[PDB]
Symmetry: D2
Subunit: 248 residues, 4 copies
């Protein structure tokens, strides 16, 4: 039978492109979402029309709290209850906003560290405990070492996620589970950003002066879960058109 994948924050944007590309490769997909319920159900419907009983949704808030572990347990459980197996976990869901050093701060920590690092950890624990080509792909950030000003908690979260990628690749390799990352530079710009600001970002990209397409990001996820990456674990592939190489 067909393998199954969980993609977090899969209702729109890069998570959607990834669930669709996994679905096109033959996977059954759990579309996780938090607030985007209409967008999630609509995607599951399109995918089920293409092949029936191959897509389900699963709602979960990935903010850190004492119940996050149970919510991450239930996301993985949802894949096993729908499809009988869980081959691939893509940790895509992310909160992203400025937290200047100079919402309560404890809420900012919970959301930016929770969604970007703690939930990927707890999902990776549940995915491994609930156990062919098993892998986890984490959506990292190619500019983690050249951070945007006033985004310390988001940068902290994405650095922690690099640590999780390495530590989990190390500890899960004996179980045959690979863990790798895909690190966009600028890809789909934030919905609220003006065209003028989007073009200042585009102009910085050496390869094409444009942002990555969602499909370009999904291609590298597709590679790392494929049998063409069967010896790759602990690797983070930048998909950034050279942006991280550009000096100030």
């Amino acid at each position: 039978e067909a393998p199954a994948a969980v993609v977090t924050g899969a209702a729109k944007r890069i998570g959607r492109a990834i669930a669709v590309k996994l679905h096109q490769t033959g996977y059954r997909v759990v579309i996780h979402y938090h607030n985007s319920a209409e967008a999630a159900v609509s995607l599951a419907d399109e995918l089920n029309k293409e092949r029936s009983n191959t897509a389900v949704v699963c709602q979960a808030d990935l903010t850190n709290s004492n119940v996050l572990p149970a919510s991450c347990e239930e996301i993985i459980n949802s894949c096993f209850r729908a499809f009988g197996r869980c081959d691939v976990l893509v940790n895509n869901a992310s909160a992203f906003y400025p937290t200047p050093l100079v919402k309560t701060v404890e809420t900012q920590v919970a959301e930016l560290i929770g969604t970007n690092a703690i939930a990927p950890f707890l999902l990776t624990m549940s995915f491994a405990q609930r156990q062919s080509n098993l892998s986890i792909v984490n959506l990292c950030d190619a500019m983690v070492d050249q951070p945007c000003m006033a985004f310390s908690l988001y940068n902290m979260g994405k650095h922690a996620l690099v640590g999780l990628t390495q530590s989990a690749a190390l500890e899960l390799a004996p179980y045959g589970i690979r863990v790798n990352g895909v690190a966009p530079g600028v890809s789909l710009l934030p919905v609220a950003m003006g065209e003028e600001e989007k073009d200042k970002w585009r102009r910085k990209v050496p390869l094409g002066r444009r942002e990555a397409s969602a499909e370009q990001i999904a291609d590298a996820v597709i590679f790392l879960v494929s049998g063409s990456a069967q010896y790759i674990t602990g690797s983070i592939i930048k998909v950034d058109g050279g942006l991280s190489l550009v000096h100030a």
Copy 2:
């Protein structure tokens, strides 16, 4: 008058060695402690005997919680109240223990991410808000990229701490605040670990097959706070005897 420093987890081992050497260089010091009251006061007594009214203690639990922000504020305020200024923050306090992927998990999160990463971030915000040779030094880990097996939350917390070092260096540079790290390899072994497990580590180190003393760590701290490091920010200095260069 003289400059003042805060050192977190300063009662024992590396934090004590940092407190002593800052004090020897002429700083007044706040010795932070959580459980080690006796040891903290005993250090403050030794320093005040050398120079009166130059060392105070400050109790706080650095576990992440709804009150960590208030505790981190209090640590910084206690330097301002005692000494009228706060020139240096050394984020030294740290929890360390394994968290296998296959104490509640949210308690391990609160300790290993709370004290290793979130408290430094909150201390950094309070230190900056309350503001010269100002600087922060974070105690990082030289082996962050070749992590110990089953130490994924610890490793996540130390990677987050590298993220904080870089983001805070960029964001506070405009205020003349430098932010740097010191990354020990094997230093003072965890007090629990036996002498057979401890000499295995000692034999792997290129430089003299021995752990770093705490004072070797404090030496790099002293350099980074000095007038000799006035253009250095966002740098992490490994002090590991070459251990991180050794392949598997």
Copy 3:
């Protein structure tokens, strides 16, 4: 029209698996070799039997010297003379042996730094000069460059230089639409010499499967990078190392 690729040191092991998989993908190939003539011809004959006029051989020493620039220009030229285009350059050839700090030393320099770094730079200049489209370069790097083997300083210097080239060439050629990327094996095909008991010390240190990568596993990452699936990727180095580089001493 089928695209064309140069693979350096393609007669055997990894560069041979790269040439074959590029050929399977529809590429015409220049099989560069230094001393391995019989193996290079035999590969070109196998590939030509699969599809006529799709493989040629090109002999060249990539040791650093006064003539290396001309040699590297000739390798690139051979691809254009054979196939009328050159889409892909794979810098795979490498010298590799210990150079303790404590052959003359200048020969060691010429061979380790020439093959691992200077020949790739010269081939990259020659490849780009001849273009000015899915054009790309892939450099074979080394996942253990920051945890080097003892007494391999010149080899380690050569492979770090190669990282620099990968990054610098990515930035400088990105306006011509040429992408530059690397693949960094950890332990793959072990040296022909080596006893099984020494090969087993290496295999046992790999977290993922306690075995070395096959040449084909490394070629797979090369194929990905030159493919339309990697169209936005430049300046990136993919480790293909079973988690080896994550393992502390």
Copy 4:
């Protein structure tokens, strides 16, 4: 007697500041130079005026060739001939100019790769072969991962020098020789540069909107050769005011 140091390219700018500061710390110095014979002899006169017999000059072209190993051996021999010992090597000499992918290219390679990497290797070999606080410091480049457009051979040379720092720290640590780097960002700008272009670069630096003084670079060199860095090997200290953390 007093320890002795070799500083390559020590006649002008940063190598001169390093030679001065080592001398001020008590070292006798070999001032290596290539073309700047007048400035070298003039610095050695100034040092000897301050303590007689504590400075010599040594002329040598560090371009790669079949006689580079003999020239590097001669630089080390000259320190032994003048002072009877050689405690510290600083690899500071460097060629720097663009080499666009699209003088002969064989000359570009010889000068940029010879001076920045091969000469350091050969000097390191000669230093070690001729042998209580021995150490080598390589002048690296903080921007080596975000290179200047058209500087591939320079950047290749500087990357190689990081490889040399690590490999030689590992292989020489059993002889008690430490090897480390110091990585300027923007420090003394090239003489050839106009003042408008100088200012563009200054405005990029987060800490102060200014270039490093040569003395600030030398300070980090003094630290790595000092008794306070005795457990530090294989480390590279960036001295860049935050420049490498700034995104495009």
